């Protein structure tokens, strides 16, 4: 019925708020925030009576002086939520001077949840049934309002009431407009004022029922002024709320093309969808804007200037976004950066065929070359002089070249060059030269032998674990004893473990920086040498602080001192994977329970925080809580209603393995000197679900429900502490009327006996009686008949009654509401 404006962001002034003068349905997010110098009298003549529907969210943060929201957005019906703000489709946060919400027309927040926090005067929040609006009511976060204490006077205008968690209270937005609730035969389509149902295609409301051409908010698609289930050819869906022809989607394209590609989405056409960017395995045509399939990850292709591309930092690496081959070479030289392992892998972790020479000269911040995730061929048609094809000198932190268990890399031409790498050891180069094919087809590499592999060790042996016994929380583990040829050289074992739910983790992964670690390291003292290879001596450790049912990666390495020839011994075992056992879980969190009939409860909860295994099923018990019998003794017509740290730095490690050689040198001097030579309740079992519809119940009797989450069933099942919740059923309306005519008994001294019988199936309790005798033409005087008076007298003795005919109305007030009045009880004497 109006124009379709885009999404704005209004702040610090109200003048931008004029741009909502004409638009009706917002194709964006509306966000009014941070208005300090605003008077509260600047909101009376400010109203937007055309806004119908919002498609992203609505945020309203710290607007001073806004009293109520019912004079600003009086015609919201649908907040779509195709995009959300931190999974919250309606945020009202730190908003002061706000009294009530008052959005008295919104019917369906489609996808998301509400967050209302930290207001100081926000009444009318416990009288909104969100389960008739939020289709996912489980995860709204409404705390710290004015209603943290039960203080505010949320009075209510005749307006229908329903149960939420037992508290059978009334529903209204304001003190003048109540919640438009519909019967559940018109589930989401929205009913009219009389109660007859509407067409099955529009959402929220409709002006005239049973016609999809006069609906005010359409759920599936909106085409040409009418509701449409799914748009006919040749139209295209657009932002999943409306349908456009080819010229709008197309036209939009040149719109962005012409705009610096700065704040626009080049819209393409794919499967009758005007899509922002069509995904991987697909290329955009340039003629008719379609997106055509390409076989596999299809090439860019990626040419470059002059063959040389010095990768100084990550911004220089922003030209190679998603290239596949390079028609040149690469020279990478990086010195510093932040989140570099993520940024370099996201930039150039898709390059496949380098057609030149790779050269990693003077890269200081490189710990490993594993960010080349898909490197497969280095052709080498342009070689570095000296005929090289992999040039590597002066990398101060290089430790791991690739992962040679799961990789392949062919350099068809050229030689290798590995100089001046301290931490990179000879084993990786000797593994690369026989996995690439350069020690075959024989071509003489130029690898220095003395200046590779210092301050480290890679001529190691290997340990073997022997006893891995797991528990639910702890794991003890023991390995083979190891002894270097001079048995005082060993200083201690170091055990690394880390949680890893996959099987691709290696040793030098995760740090990518100066000396950091993602592992957890513990130290083990060496055992006692009993001078016998057959003894109970081999060491071990007991890891304690774990979590049940996860996969841990564990390895262990020795710590030996350097011999005086530059010969480092030692052994690091293979990476092993262990799995802890299962344990009974915790309680299911925040169960809720709304009713919809006279004998039904539905439940909604959350899956538990730590499942500790594949949860097979749940288990739910319900028992009856009959009646609070101490409620039997209150006259209700008087007031109302009763109801550990361990870091090992470089200086400490060097001091330790210097003292542990000073002691060895002293006792070696002692052995040189002193030795001189000679010349019950029912149960239900719900599987793989988070809801349950209980049936076969009594009306308006509070049930207590216990919840269990049970993970393994067949071998003598075990599960958790039960979560407790209470529920109520919505009462029947007919069951409170007085059955039969009320009997009159006329005593002579002007006290009369009006006796009746209690209704044979009340809802909870019948607490009061309202009797009303009146002469037709005279005033009425109300009488409250208590439960105790009726119990003692089996009727009521009505004193102070002048003679004559009287119309008498009888009713019995129960805990639900009014029933109906009886016939006018005529006890008559002829004048």
């Amino acid at each position: 019925p109006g124009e379709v404006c885009p999404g704005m962001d209004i702040r610090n002034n109200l003048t931008r708020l004029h741009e909502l003068e004409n638009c009706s349905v917002i194709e964006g997010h509306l966000q009014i925030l941070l208005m300090f110098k605003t008077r509260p009298e600047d909101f009376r003549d400010l109203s937007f009576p055309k806004l119908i529907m919002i498609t992203d969210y609505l945020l309203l943060f710290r607007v001073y002086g806004l009293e109520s929201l019912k004079d600003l957005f009086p015609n919201l019906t649908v907040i779509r939520g195709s995009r959300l703000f931190f999974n919250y489709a309606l945020v009202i946060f730190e908003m002061v001077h706000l009294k009530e919400l008052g959005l008295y027309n919104l019917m369906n927040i489609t996808r998301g949840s509400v967050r209302i926090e930290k207001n100081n005067e926000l009444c009318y929040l416990a009288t909104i049934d969100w389960s008739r609006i939020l289709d996912s009511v489980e995860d709204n976060h409404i705390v710290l309002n004015k209603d943290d204490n039960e203080e505010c006077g949320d009075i209510c205008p005749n307006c229908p009431a329903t149960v939420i968690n037992g508290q059978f209270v009334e529903r209204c937005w304001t003190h003048s407009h109540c919640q438009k609730v519909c019967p559940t035969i018109c589930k989401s389509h929205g009913c009219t004022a009389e109660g007859l149902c509407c067409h099955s295609e529009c959402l929220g409301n409709c002006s005239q029922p049973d016609d999809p051409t006069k609906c005010v908010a359409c759920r599936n698609f909106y085409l040409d002024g009418r509701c449409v289930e799914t748009c006919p050819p040749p139209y295209y869906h657009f932002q999943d709320w409306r349908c456009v022809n080819f010229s709008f989607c197309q036209d939009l394209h040149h719109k962005c093309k012409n705009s610096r590609r700065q704040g626009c989405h080049q819209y393409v056409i794919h499967n009758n969808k005007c899509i922002p960017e069509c995904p991987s395995g697909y290329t955009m045509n340039s003629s008719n804007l379609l997106c055509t399939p390409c076989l596999g990850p299809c090439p860019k292709v990626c040419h470059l200037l002059e063959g040389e591309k010095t990768i100084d930092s990550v911004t220089s690496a922003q030209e190679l976004r998603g290239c596949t081959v390079i028609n040149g070479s690469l020279i990478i030289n990086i010195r510093g950066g932040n989140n570099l392992a993520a940024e370099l892998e996201a930039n150039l972790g898709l390059i496949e065929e380098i057609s030149g020479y790779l050269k990693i000269r003077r890269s200081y911040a490189l710990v490993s070359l594993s960010f080349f995730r898909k490197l497969r061929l280095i052709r080498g048609e342009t070689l570095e002089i000296g005929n090289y094809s992999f040039y590597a000198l002066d990398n101060q932190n290089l430790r791991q070249l690739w992962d040679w268990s799961k990789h392949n890399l062919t350099t068809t031409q050229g030689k290798l060059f590995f100089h001046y790498n301290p931490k990179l050891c000879l084993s990786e180069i000797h593994k690369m030269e026989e996995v690439s094919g350069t020690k075959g087809r024989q071509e003489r590499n130029d690898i220095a032998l003395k200046t590779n592999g210092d301050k480290a060790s890679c001529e190691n042996e290997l340990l073997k674990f022997s006893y891995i016994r797991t528990s639910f929380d702890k794991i003890l583990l023991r390995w083979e004893p190891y002894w270097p040829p001079d048995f005082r050289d060993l200083l201690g074992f170091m055990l690394f473990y880390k949680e890893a739910p996959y099987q691709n983790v290696t040793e030098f992964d995760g740090q990518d920086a100066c000396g950091s670690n993602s592992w957890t390291v513990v130290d083990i003292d060496p055992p006692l040498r009993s001078n016998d290879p057959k003894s109970q001596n081999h060491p071990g450790w007991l890891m304690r602080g774990l979590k049940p049912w996860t996969q841990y990666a564990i390895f262990v390495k020795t710590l030996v001192t350097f011999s005086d020839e530059r010969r480092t011994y030692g052994a690091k075992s293979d990476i092993i994977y262990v799995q802890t056992d299962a344990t009974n879980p915790s309680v299911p969190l925040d169960p809720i329970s709304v009713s919809n009939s006279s004998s039904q409860i539905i439940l909604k909860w959350k899956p538990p925080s730590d499942p500790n295994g594949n949860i097979t099923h749940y288990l739910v018990f319900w028992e009856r809580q009959a009646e609070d019998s101490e409620l039997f003794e209150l006259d209700y017509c008087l007031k109302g209603l009763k109801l550990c740290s361990c870091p090992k730095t470089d200086s400490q490690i060097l001091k330790e393995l210097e003292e542990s050689s000073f002691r060895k040198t002293f006792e070696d001097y002692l052995h040189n000197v002193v030795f001189v030579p000679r010349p019950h309740r029912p149960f239900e079992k719900v599987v793989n679900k988070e809801s349950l519809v209980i049936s076969g119940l009594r009306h308006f009797t509070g049930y207590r429900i216990e919840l269990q989450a049970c993970n393994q069933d067949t071998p003598e099942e075990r599960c958790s502490v039960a979560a407790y919740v209470s529920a109520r059923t919505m009462p029947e309306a007919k069951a409170d009327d007085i059955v039969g005519p009320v009997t009159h008994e006329i005593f002579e001294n002007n006290v009369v006996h009006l006796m009746w019988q209690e209704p044979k199936e009340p809802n909870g309790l019948i607490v009061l009686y309202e009797v009303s005798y009146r002469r037709y033409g005279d005033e009425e005087l109300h009488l409250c008949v208590s439960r105790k008076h009726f119990a003692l007298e089996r009727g009521c003795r009505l004193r102070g009654l002048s003679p004559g005919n009287y119309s008498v109305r009888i009713r019995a007030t129960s805990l639900a509401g009014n029933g109906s009045w009886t016939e006018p009880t005529y006890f008559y004497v002829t004048d």
Partner: peptide, 25 residues
């Protein structure tokens, strides 16, 4: 292994001549 070092040799070369005793100048 028989690379006897440390206290291993002072416990293991007492055993080869436990009757005579050590020698010095």
């Amino acid at each position: 292994n028989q690379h006897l070092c440390g206290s291993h040799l002072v416990e293991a070369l007492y055993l080869v001549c436990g009757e005579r005793g050590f020698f010095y100048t």
